[PDB]
Design an enzyme around this catalytic site. Structure first.
Site, PDB file in Angstrom:
ATOM      1  N   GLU A 190      -0.322 -11.920  -6.423  1.00 39.73           N
ATOM      2  CA  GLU A 190       0.939 -11.305  -7.086  1.00 39.73           C
ATOM      3  C   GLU A 190       1.615 -12.390  -8.121  1.00 39.73           C
ATOM      4  OE1 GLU A 190       2.585  -8.463  -4.348  1.00 39.73           O
ATOM      5  OE2 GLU A 190       0.426  -7.672  -4.121  1.00 39.73           O
ATOM      6  N   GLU A 308      -6.243  -6.283  -2.605  1.00 37.51           N
ATOM      7  CA  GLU A 308      -5.432  -6.184  -1.426  1.00 37.51           C
ATOM      8  C   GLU A 308      -4.904  -4.653  -1.563  1.00 37.51           C
ATOM      9  OE1 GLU A 308      -2.060  -9.192  -0.744  1.00 37.51           O
ATOM     10  OE2 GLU A 308      -0.750  -7.345  -0.536  1.00 37.51           O
TER      11      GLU A 308
END
Ligand SMILES: *[C@@H]1O[C@H](CO)[C@@H](O[C@@H]2O[C@H](CO)[C@@H](O[C@@H]3O[C@H](CO)[C@@H](O)[C@H](O)[C@@H]3O)[C@H](O)[C@H]2NC(C)=O)[C@H](O)[C@H]1NC(C)=O
Ligand SMILES: *[C@@H]1O[C@H](CO[C@@H]2O[C@@H](C)[C@@H](O)[C@@H](O)[C@@H]2O)[C@@H](O)[C@H](O)[C@H]1NC(C)=O
Ligand SMILES: *[C@@H]1O[C@H](CO)[C@@H](O)[C@H](O)[C@H]1NC(C)=O
Ligand SMILES: *[C@@H]1O[C@H](CO)[C@@H](O)[C@H](O)[C@H]1NC(C)=O
EC number: 3.2.1.166
Length: 508
Positions: A190, A308
């Site tokens: 991220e 994820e």
């Protein structure tokens, strides 16, 4: 009339998903205090992980960018004792945790889980180091479980002029080479939130150059064809989609799949009603479409993976993410991901901090485990299509694949249907010709006990699902139906149905 006609489109596959379509994660924060990685030596966890093979095991999470490989890091009493007990033993057959070490780690684990969860919510991450033995725990857990390890490298190790400094990665890659480890790689987690997490902003063009750098190191390694996945961006809000696009333009050539993350809800605010709301389920479709837009305009045909994903961020929704009620989001996500072209979906998390885990603090499977296991055993790689007639598809959600060919009860041409009923009444599904006079095996999941949908226990066709013992999963027992009968789906439930002798040419 609660009787709904199904349409089937079986002429050819819509998509082909990986055999590893249902995959799992281990959060990188399990290594914050690396002693807790020894929990992965449990034979019970091994049994459970093996049940999900074939699958990827992605070691990553926020902590990916605050972990540093130290080949000289000292070990602890727990680690030294675990490795000493494995010496001269087939670790995959006979590996276990010494009972004193297991007892201590299990006593400490609820405190540790609170620390890990609060550190996350406060966004106050420190660097920590991990040893060669930690790598070895991850590798052997994955290898012994028939899983393929994906390891996220730290992308916040940076030169003066804002370039990825690859020297720590090189240390790690050389160590892994010297042990003969078959590992695939990611870089960063991220990156869209690096400004918030580390007050460093790395843009996507630069991150692509970093991936180019890593690819060059992988090409010079002894494992020359190791795979590389990225960039593990969050879900495609405007600034994140812009970052994904620039990344793919600069680094898209060197990645084997594009990885992004998705959570439906904030775990702090999610309600029971949100977990059953088809409008919440439907917003995932918008995320998927935006991702495929960015990918199609920059690297068309490139594989797209959910790297994820789960019900709710911030470690999961207390009293909801670990329940039967979490299954609606999980099964729907799999259904839609398959039908819209996502090739692999990586579940946050197999085991660890949060309550979106598949397996709990005592290594016991949650309802989502059992759902995942049934999915793995029944659902094949070839994605077909189903639909319900009457344009009220919001609350009766149906998915269709070829039956998993590895399953010994079934054969080439058989179909697996799966269905979610979010109406508050029972619905009956009618199969279309030429599947309307077939033997069908039903696999209906319902929650056990007084908490109803909020239960952590589940029955399959009226039999409580439970591990037999630490080394043994139970059989998953079908309920054969009368040929020609409609497929009954109770209020707020989900089920699989295997259509036997369906003889679908596309599934051969
Ligand atoms: C994405 O991030 C990179 C940073 O890694 C940005 O590259 C940097 O962009 C600036 C341009 O505004 C460069 O500064 C310029 O440097 C030259 C000397 O090379 C000087 O003549 C100019 O007056 C100016 O200061 C900087 O060098 C450059 N760095 C690298 C390594 O290329 C890039 O602009 C960012 N792109 C986007 C779309 O945000
Ligand atoms: C149940 O849901 C209602 C709306 O759903 C419709 O009515 C139910 C009974 C089914 O026939 C379903 O197929 C329809 O889509 C709500 O308006 C109602 O308040 C809810 N009832 C209860 C008892 O909770
Ligand atoms: C972590 O360590 C790296 C290099 O060892 C350094 O560049 C970075 O700023 C450190 N970050 C924090 C938050 O301590
Ligand atoms: C990269 O990191 C290493 C190890 O910390 C350091 O010694 C080296 O100076 C750094 N290289 C660059 C190019 O910044």
């Amino acid at each position: 009339q609660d009787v709904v006609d199904l349409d089937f489109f079986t002429q050819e596959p819509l998509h082909l998903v990986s055999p590893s379509f249902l995959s799992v994660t281990i959060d990188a924060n399990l290594a914050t205090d690396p002693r807790f990685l020894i929990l992965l030596g449990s034979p019970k966890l091994r049994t459970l992980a093996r049940g999900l093979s074939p699958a990827y095991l992605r070691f990553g999470g926020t902590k990916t960018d605050f972990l540093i490989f130290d080949p000289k890091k000292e070990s602890t009493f727990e680690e030294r004792s675990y490795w000493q007990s494995q010496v001269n033993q087939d670790i995959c057959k006979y590996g276990s945790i010494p009972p004193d070490v297991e007892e201590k780690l299990r006593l400490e684990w609820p405190y540790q889980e609170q620390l890990l969860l609060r550190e996350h919510y406060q966004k106050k991450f420190k660097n920590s180091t991990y040893s060669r033995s930690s790598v070895d725990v991850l590798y052997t857990f994955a290898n012994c479980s028939g899983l393929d390890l994906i390891f996220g490298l730290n992308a916040l190790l940076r030169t003066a002029d804002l370039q990825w400094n690859s020297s720590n990665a090189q240390l790690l890659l050389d160590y892994c080479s010297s042990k003969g480890y078959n590992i695939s790689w990611e870089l960063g987690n991220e990156p869209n939130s690096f400004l918030k997490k580390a007050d460093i902003f790395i843009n996507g063009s630069q991150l692509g150059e970093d991936f180019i750098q890593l690819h060059k190191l992988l090409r010079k390694s002894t494992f020359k064809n190791a795979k590389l996945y990225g960039p593990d961006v969050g879900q495609p809000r405007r600034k994140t989609a812009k970052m994904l696009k620039s990344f793919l333009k600069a680094g898209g050539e060197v990645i084997d799949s594009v990885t992004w993350h998705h959570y439906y809800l904030n775990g702090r605010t999610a309600t029971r009603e949100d977990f059953l709301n088809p409008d919440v389920l439907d917003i995932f479709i918008s995320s998927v479409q935006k991702v495929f837009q960015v990918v199609e305009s920059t690297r068309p045909g490139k594989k797209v993976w959910l790297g994820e994903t789960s019900s709710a961020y911030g470690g999961g929704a207390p009293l909801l993410s670990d329940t039967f009620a979490a299954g609606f989001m999980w099964l729907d996500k799999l259904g839609l991901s398959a039908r819209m072209g996502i090739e692999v979906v990586m579940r946050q998390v197999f085991f660890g901090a949060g309550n979106y885990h598949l397996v709990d603090e005592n290594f016991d499977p949650l309802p989502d485990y059992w759902l995942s296991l049934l999915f793995k055993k029944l659902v094949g790689t070839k994605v077909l299509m189903a639909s319900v007639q009457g344009s009220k598809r919001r609350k009766l959600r149906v998915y269709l694949h070829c039956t998993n060919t590895d399953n010994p009860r079934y054969k080439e041409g058989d179909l697996t249907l799966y269905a979610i009923n979010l109406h508050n009444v029972t619905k009956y599904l009618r199969l279309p010709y030429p599947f309307s006079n077939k033997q069908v095996d039903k696999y209906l999941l319902r929650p056990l006990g007084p908490h109803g949908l909020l239960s952590k226990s589940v029955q399959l066709n009226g039999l409580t699902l439970k591990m037999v013992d630490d080394q043994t999963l139970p059989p998953l027992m079908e309920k054969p139906l009368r040929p020609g009968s409609s497929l009954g789906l109770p209020a707020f439930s989900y089920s699989f149905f295997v259509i036997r002798n369906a003889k679908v040419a596309a599934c051969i």
